[model samples]
Target: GADCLNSFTAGVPGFVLDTQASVSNGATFLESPTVRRGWDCVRACCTTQNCNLALVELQPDRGEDAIAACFLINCLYEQNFVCKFAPREGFINYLTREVYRSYRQLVDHHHHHH
Candidate 1:
């Protein structure tokens, strides 16, 4: 069903969902949990400032719907996807930015290279 994808709205501005085929490394200082839908994954990231990224896992092991393993991140590092969405292996990562500013650093911020 498209309910997951259809209802999955981007919480962060200029967010693009990409797979992790080209990128490497995952997770944060936190443990982790599981969500049922992709939209929930989006909402989860949206509600948190600690997480600026989402790694959605497409696993059909849960019932008949695709399960999303939403791994939220604070910084956009080590991601090498050049499109809106890339299906790398099975994990898709999402990015959000407002023009080049979002991806870049601020005056007080340090090292804005991605």
Candidate 2:
């Protein structure tokens, strides 16, 4: 829930993904956490209205589907300075910035209400 909100007020400045990166300065991304065709790339968001962040982690024990873990959170990474990142291993953190942002008010708001 917090991370969902974090998506909006996160990231840096510049483009989006070309755009931004870390979403936040001290933000060590467990982040963007999505996709399967990524390289030395980064992720984030901006407009909280139609913005959301999806994170994925690779799971080598899913039998066949092998889709591992997938999560879509509210809040787009915000703009500030600069949010760019690089990674290691078979880790694929995909941030589709060139795409449109999806905003889920009811879903995220429901969580905020406690």
Candidate 3:
């Protein structure tokens, strides 16, 4: 999660929500404790001066509605500014590929200009 967040803060945007749970696949709900813990973690991690956004990746056991609820709660209660939802694997792969491409471009630009 930290690695994902770090990559995201480095200019990668978007995150994937995995939809799976251990207790019940149908129980697409984030418990209060989990939400609170997540909020705290976000707040703490994002308090750094370099931090800009925090993305909450929902687990696979959860559905869209469940993810939405969690996002709303984070926005309302944790005061998070940016949140997005996508399929976990897809989002991660897309961001990784995009960031690498962008990084290469940046290097090339720097090499040419500087």
Candidate 4:
């Protein structure tokens, strides 16, 4: 699981448990007043417009299964230097399926322009 994060990129439906990482500079937004699970955080990201990433805090006891807080971000992994990761703690960086589709659209747009 930890190794997957090393190879993890943006615009993909997956998550990375990084105790020393935080997804920042992506214009994070918080809509859910009470998001308790990492799963809900991902769900919220999928429902919101342009929300491709979720930075979720985990409980000290429950860890990854329990979510303490959720930050919804409206950007891709490396798009325009958005959603970049930084050194932090107890956060799981999550990418939603929307990110994949959004990234695909961008790639398609680029290909068609040429």
The top-ranked prediction according to TM-score is: 4
- Per-residue accuracy of model 3 over 25-78 as CA lDDT, tens digit each: 221223222342334334433334333223343343553222222221121113
Which digits, one per residue and each the tens of the lDDT, describe model 4 over residues 55-110? 67777468766878877655534555243433445566666543545444533443
Candidate 2 wrongly placed segments (more than 4 Å):
1-23, 26-53, 62-64, 71-81, 97-114
| Of 1 and 4, the candidate ranking higher by lDDT | 4
Per-residue alpha-carbon lDDT of model 1 for 1-114, expressed as tens digits? 333233222333323344342133343322234886656676676566555556566665763256556665544444432323322455554445432344333223545576
Clashing pairs in 3: 18-59, 18-60, 19-59, 19-60, 19-61, 20-60, 20-61, 21-61
Residue 114, model 2: Cα distance from true site in angstroms: 52
Worst 10 residues of 1 by lDDT: 6-15
The candidate maximizing lDDT is: 4
The C-alpha TM-scores of every prediction are 0.45, 0.30, 0.21, 0.53
Greater-TM-score candidate between 3 and 4: 4
User: Model 3: which ten-residue window has the lowest total lDDT?
Assistant: 68-77
**Candidate 1 regions with alpha-carbon error over 4 angstroms:** 1-31, 61-65, 76-87, 99-114
User: Relative to the true structure, how large is the alpha-carbon lDDT of every model?
Assistant: 0.46, 0.33, 0.30, 0.53
TM-score-based ranking: 4, 1, 2, 3
